[PDB]
Amino acid sequence: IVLTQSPASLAVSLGQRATISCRASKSVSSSVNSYMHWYQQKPGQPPKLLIYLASNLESGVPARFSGSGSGTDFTLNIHPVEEEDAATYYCQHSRELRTFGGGTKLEIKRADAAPTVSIFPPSSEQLTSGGASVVCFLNNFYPKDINVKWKIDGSERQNGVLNSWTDQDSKDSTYSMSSTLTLTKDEYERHNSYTCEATHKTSTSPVVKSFNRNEC
Amino acid sequence: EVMLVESGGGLVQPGGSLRLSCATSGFTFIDYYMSWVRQPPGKALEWLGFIRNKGNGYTTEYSTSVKGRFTISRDNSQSIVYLQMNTLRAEDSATYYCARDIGYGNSPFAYWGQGTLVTVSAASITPPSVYPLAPGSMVTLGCLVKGYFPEPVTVTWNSGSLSSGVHTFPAVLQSDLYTLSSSVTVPSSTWPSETVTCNVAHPASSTKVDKKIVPR
Numbered sequence A: 001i002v003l004t005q006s007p008a009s010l011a012v013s014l015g016q017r018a019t020i021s022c023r024a025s026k027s028v029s030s031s032v033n034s035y036m037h038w039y040q041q042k043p044g045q046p047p048k049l050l051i052y053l054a055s056n057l058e059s060g061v062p063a064r065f066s067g068s069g070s071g072t073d074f075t076l077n078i079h080p081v082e083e084e085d086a087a088t089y090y091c092q093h094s095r096e097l098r099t100f101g102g103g104t105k106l107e108i109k110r111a112d113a114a115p116t117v118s119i120f121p122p123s124s125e126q127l128t129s130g131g132a133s134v135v136c137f138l139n140n141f142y143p144k145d146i147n148v149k150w151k152i153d154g155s156e157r158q159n160g161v162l163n164s165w166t167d168q169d170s171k172d173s174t175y176s177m178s179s180t181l182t183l184t185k186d187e188y189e190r191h192n193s194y195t196c197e198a199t200h201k202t203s204t205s206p207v208v209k210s211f212n213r214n215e216c
Numbered sequence B: 001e002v003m004l005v006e007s008g009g010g011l012v013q014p015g016g017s018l019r020l021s022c023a024t025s026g027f028t029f030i031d032y033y034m035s036w037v038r039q040p041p042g043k044a045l046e047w048l049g050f051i052r053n054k055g056n057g058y059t060t061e062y063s064t065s066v067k068g069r070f071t072i073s074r075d076n077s078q079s080i081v082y083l084q085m086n087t088l089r090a091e092d093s094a095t096y097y098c099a100r101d102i103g104y105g106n107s108p109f110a111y112w113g114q115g116t117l118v119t120v121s122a123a124s125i126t127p128p129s130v131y132p133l134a135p136g137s138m139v140t141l142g143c144l145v146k147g148y149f150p151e152p153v154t155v156t157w158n159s160g161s162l163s164s165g166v167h168t169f170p171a172v173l174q175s176d177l178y179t180l181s182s183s184v185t186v187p188s189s190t191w192p193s194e195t196v197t198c199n200v201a202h203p204a205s206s207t208k209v210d211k212k213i214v215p216r
């Protein structure tokens, strides 16, 4: 027995209805009960039980979440979606072999948000240690589509760039990104201008942040 | 009331073995089934098995994927459930959760532990180097947390007093080593007037470091 989840990923604007399907490969109902559970999981947290026995709301859980279905076909309904709802949702067979479905990621849609870019040279204690990383943060933007190009003395640097996104923010619905240019102290010290350029739809040209090492 | 608290997670070499525990309180432990559930980083939840209550003789059930390799057992006098894992491989690398399963008229998986991260690799345990990120209306400071293994680290700012305006990014693997950055935005009317310090913890190597964010 396998549980299959609908879109796997879903975007819904604030205030509107989100609908997550779950299909079981075999009936999970008896005459009396439908053995389906629904969970919510936020990054770095355990799952949280929302719905037990297919249609009962767990104690403590807000009434915008509801479940339904029987046999093989099931639904989680979130209405109105709020910002805190940004999360992954799992259905599960709540008896026998207790199978989990694969998850549906819920994205909260919102107005575009321009990134706030900050660039950071190597810390002088890191230089003392023999390393060098140029870090720039691209914060609180939407949509999640973004890219960073690095320029050392005018030319683009492709290798040694580490990118990392936050999960969608629970409060304001934005994404954040960290772009770390990893470098040997050797190459750091042999070049002068360091640039990170963020390409995002909120601007017709790259949001550019720069420094010169000799000017530090 | 109800609390499930795990430990025992960490680094283990391929082919190795490990025992995680899960300490419970706030319910009658012996009358409840207990489950173990795992989640590889970025992937779906996977049910691993349960051990039954006193009524059913503390017998055990496992998923097809871990039968004969993993063992669930319980210390009823102390209210701990265990998961003994042998012959570990790459794919076993996950966050491992215990959860209260069925007992009394109750639904399973209402209560979960915070989870513990198990990592299986040949790579050694390395402490992080923790570097301050200082600049060149609101001001963004950061901490780079470089060259550590294995996960997790935890990062707070001002020992927890600063929480909003924080973006701690997920770690990235670079050739056996993890790199992570945290970011904090505060009003410039409070920096550097009032101090800002990042607190980084690496339990896997008893490291606990504070970095005062000092201007350049």
Ligand SMILES: N[C@@H]1[C@@H](O)[C@H](OP(=O)(O)O)[C@@H](CO[C@]2(C(=O)O)C[C@@H](O[C@]3(C(=O)O)C[C@@H](O)[C@@H](O)[C@@H]([C@H](O)CO[C@]4(C(=O)O)C[C@@H](O)[C@@H](O)[C@@H]([C@H](O)CO)O4)O3)[C@@H](O)[C@@H]([C@H](O)CO)O2)O[C@H]1O
Pocket: A029, A030, A031, A032, A033, A053, A094, A095, A096, A097, B052, B053, B055, B056, B102, B103, B105, B106, B107
């Ligand atoms: N009259 C109800 C009957 O209709 C229910 O089942 P149907 O939907 O008609 O098929 C029945 C459901 O009971 C269970 C269940 O899922 O079977 C089990 C309940 O727990 C007891 C119990 O009867 O009170 C007590 C437990 O200590 C166990 O002994 C179980 C059961 O005997 C064994 O349970 C397991 C097992 O392997 O140990 C795990 C279960 O989750 C389930 O997988 C069962 C199998 O169905 C085989 O029986 O095996 O029985 C409750 O957990 C109950 C739940 O509260 C329903 O919401 O589900 O309950 C009748 O009252």
